[PDB]
Write a protein that binds this ligand. Structure first.
Ligand SMILES: OC[C@H]1O[C@@H](O[C@H]2[C@H](O)[C@@H](O)[C@H](O[C@H]3[C@H](O)[C@@H](F)[C@H](O)O[C@@H]3CO)O[C@@H]2CO)[C@H](O)[C@@H](O)[C@@H]1O
Length: 222
């Protein structure tokens, strides 16, 4: 195991994914302990007001995020070359606290490895406490055999399309391309954009210690 407490500390697991503390919204300590297949949040101090940015997005990813590219990743890859993008996750939830468990999937018109990607897909596997996505609800969508409440808006940097589960999902395997297709169909990307990373983790606003990604996988096949 490897403990990371630096706000933007990272480590690689299984020689394939990056675990990031990614403490981008908080002045209080946070630590994650990386395992060979995921990570656990071992300290997550402080609170963030629940109508604003979360404290952080501790997560594991395949791809490139602010110059940090996971070992051997084939991302960025143009979407029209992707046959499938399977991913799977197992989450450990905490009772109480205020957080989501979410995927972040980033798309851009360029083969982007640094900076803000133009579109963000956020898939909320769980929601606890009085938090909601960026923007406005739109309606429901059926993606991957599951129903989602779709939200759309912008954060000032990028577009955000969110798919929110009706109740907690502790584990799933799915095709990221199913969500990319739904995003393209709403005009928030095009078939000749690039997939630049597939990330999974948590956005905590209050507490968060004990949250875990037990396992994660992501492949992008061309
Ligand atoms: O990780 C190093 C870089 O962190 C940058 O902060 C990013 C952060 O990495 C992203 O994960 C985060 O994404 C937000 C997104 O903007 C929201 F729309 C969404 O609801 O939630 C995700 C996850 O919380 O965005 C922040 C801030 O832009 C930081 O700015 C860089 O300087 C740093 O190099």
């Amino acid at each position: 195991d490897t403990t990371i407490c630096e706000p933007f500390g990272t480590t690689t697991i299984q020689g394939r994914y990056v675990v990031q503390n990614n403490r981008w919204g908080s002045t209080a300590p946070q630590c994650v302990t990386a395992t060979d297949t995921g990570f656990r949040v071992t300290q997550a101090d402080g609170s963030a007001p629940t109508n604003g940015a979360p404290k952080s997005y501790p997560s594991v990813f395949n791809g490139c995020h602010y110059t940090n590219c996971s070992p051997g990743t084939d991302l960025p890859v143009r979407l029209d070359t992707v046959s499938a993008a399977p991913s799977s996750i197992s989450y450990g939830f905490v009772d109480g606290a205020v957080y989501n468990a979410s995927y972040d999937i980033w798309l851009d018109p360029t083969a982007r490895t640094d900076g803000v990607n133009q579109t963000e897909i956020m898939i909320w596997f769980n929601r606890v406490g009085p938090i909601q996505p960026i923007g406005s609800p739109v309606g429901t969508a059926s993606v991957g055999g599951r129903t989602w409440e779709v939200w759309s808006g912008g954060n000032g940097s990028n577009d955000v399309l969110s798919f929110v589960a009706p109740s907690a999902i502790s584990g799933w395997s799915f095709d990221v391309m199913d969500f990319v297709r739904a995003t393209v169909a709403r005009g928030l990307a095009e078939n000749d954009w690039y997939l630049t990373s597939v990330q999974a983790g948590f956005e905590p606003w209050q507490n968060g210690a004990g949250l875990a990604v037990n396992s994660f996988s992501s492949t992008v096949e061309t």
